């Protein structure tokens, strides 16, 4: 028994998108979730769901909804899925095995690319252990080798943990920036805060 539409507009159409390093997380509750506006429009190239189907989204109710957003390379969109492996999955953003939700990703080369630039977006390349599901790491400490302590980036394993994609138009489709939004759902019984536009 709610009437206010969910704030999907400020999540998908937002001009700014967070880095895969320190990705953003927006909570959605107490609203009507009409998903037709998402997949009906042209710019959203890819849209996949796990545990549910795109057509059934408008007919379901959800107890809690989270909208994670970030930017990754085109070839790395594959890594955004349950049980996957790779830099983004291992060190930046990992989904749970029982993930229930959908992943929306589309090309944003026109927005997020500059000729010899686009240092806005960074990703973690070194970490001692893989992240837990939905884990977040904002630290940037140097990755000391162990045979000698480190205070700054040095030789052998003493690397600076983060790196930047440096998107440019000259890159191919695979390396071009892709704007990604991940929706997570919970399907328990009442109370339920999010429901579709049903009667």
């Amino acid at each position, epitope marked *: 028994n709610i009437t206010n539409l969910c704030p999907f507009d400020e999540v998908f159409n937002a001009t700014r998108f967070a880095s895969v390093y320190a990705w953003n997380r927006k909570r959605i509750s107490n609203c009507v979730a009409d998903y037709s506006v998402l997949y009906n429009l042209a710019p959203f190239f890819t849209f996949k769901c796990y545990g549910v189907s795109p057509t059934k989204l408008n007919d379901l109710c959800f107890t809690n909804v989270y909208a994670d957003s970030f930017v990754i390379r085109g070839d790395e969109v594959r890594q955004i899925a349950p049980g996957q492996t790779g830099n983004i999955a291992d060190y930046n953003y990992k989904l749970p095995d029982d993930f229930t939700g959908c992943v929306i990703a589309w090309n944003s080369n026109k927005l997020d690319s*500059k000729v010899s630039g686009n240092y806005n977006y960074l990703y973690r390349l070194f970490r001692k252990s893989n992240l837990k599901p939905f884990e977040r790491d904002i630290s940037t400490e140097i990755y000391q080798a162990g045979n000698k302590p480190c205070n700054g980036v040095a030789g052998f394993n003493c690397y600076f943990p983060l790196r930047s994609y440096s998107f440019r138009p000259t890159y191919g489709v695979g390396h071009q920036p892709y704007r990604v939004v991940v929706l997570s759902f919970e399907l328990l019984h009442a109370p339920a805060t999010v429901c579709g536009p049903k009667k």
Partner: antibody, heavy 122, light 106 residues
Framework: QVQLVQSGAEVKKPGSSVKVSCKAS????????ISWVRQAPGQGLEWMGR????????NYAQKFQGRVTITADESTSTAYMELSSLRSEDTAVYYC????????????????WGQGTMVTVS | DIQMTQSPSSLSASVGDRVTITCRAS??????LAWYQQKPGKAPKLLIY???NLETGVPSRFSGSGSGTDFTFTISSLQPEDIATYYC?????????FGGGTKVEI
């Protein structure tokens, strides 16, 4: 908090070079990117180049390409920029500023600006 | 390189008078514009970092909006502390270009 402190002013005859610096203070040097902006007397601001010391990448405008060099020194956290073959129209106030781009999802907009150095040819 | 035309070059207005400054890009930019405030003999201050996003600590008195080529920055009211020169900066592409600037006079 972040603060940028620039060196003193400089006065030179034409054909010389300048070696101004801006020392980063507060936080850690692993989180700053520096850009240099020119402002001729009474005219608008002009962007020269960008330096990201951690990634070891620098960029310059087309006019200053091959004439301005920007460097940095981690040991002293001093961002260095040099201008070669000085000529009278190079006179301007030069500002050291920190980019927001080199961070999570921000852009090139300059957040913190240095006190600026007066450079004149005479 | 991408060039921006900023008009009017100078605008004079009284206390409490609304101010409107127009910045026009020669090529379409996807809202990647920022506005700065420069007091005489002082470094520019970043007022608006995105097409409409105000920086922390900047009074809501200031505002801005626009997309594509045409952008506008406005002051809801002229306080004495608002008399300054404002520049529009485009950062869609690497060769950052500042606008011609708009000198504000009481």
């Amino acid at each position: 908090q972040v603060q940028l402190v620039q060196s003193g002013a400089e006065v030179k005859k034409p054909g010389s070079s300048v070696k101004v610096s801006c020392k980063a203070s507060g936080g850690t040097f692993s989180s700053y990117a520096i850009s240099w902006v020119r402002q001729a007397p009474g005219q608008g601001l002009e962007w020269m180049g960008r330096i990201i010391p951690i990634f070891g990448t620098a960029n310059y405008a087309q006019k200053f390409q091959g004439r301005v060099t920007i460097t940095a020194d981690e040991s002293t956290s001093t961002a260095y920029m040099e201008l070669s073959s000085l000529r009278s129209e190079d006179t301007a106030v030069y500002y050291c500023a920190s980019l927001a781009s080199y961070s999570s999802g921000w852009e090139d907009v300059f957040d913190i600006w240095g006190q600026g150095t007066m450079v004149t040819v005479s | 390189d991408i060039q921006m035309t900023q008009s009017p070059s100078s605008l004079s207005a009284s206390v409490g008078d609304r101010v409107t400054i127009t910045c026009r890009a020669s090529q379409g930019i996807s809202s990647w514009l920022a506005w700065y405030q420069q007091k005489p003999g002082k470094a520019p201050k970043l007022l608006i970092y995105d097409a409409s996003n105000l920086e922390t600590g900047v009074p809501s008195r200031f505002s801005g909006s626009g997309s594509g080529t045409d952008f506008t920055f406005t002051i809801s009211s002229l306080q004495p502390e608002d008399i300054a020169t404002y520049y529009c900066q485009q950062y869609d592409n690497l060769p950052l270009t500042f606008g011609g600037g708009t000198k504000v006079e009481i």
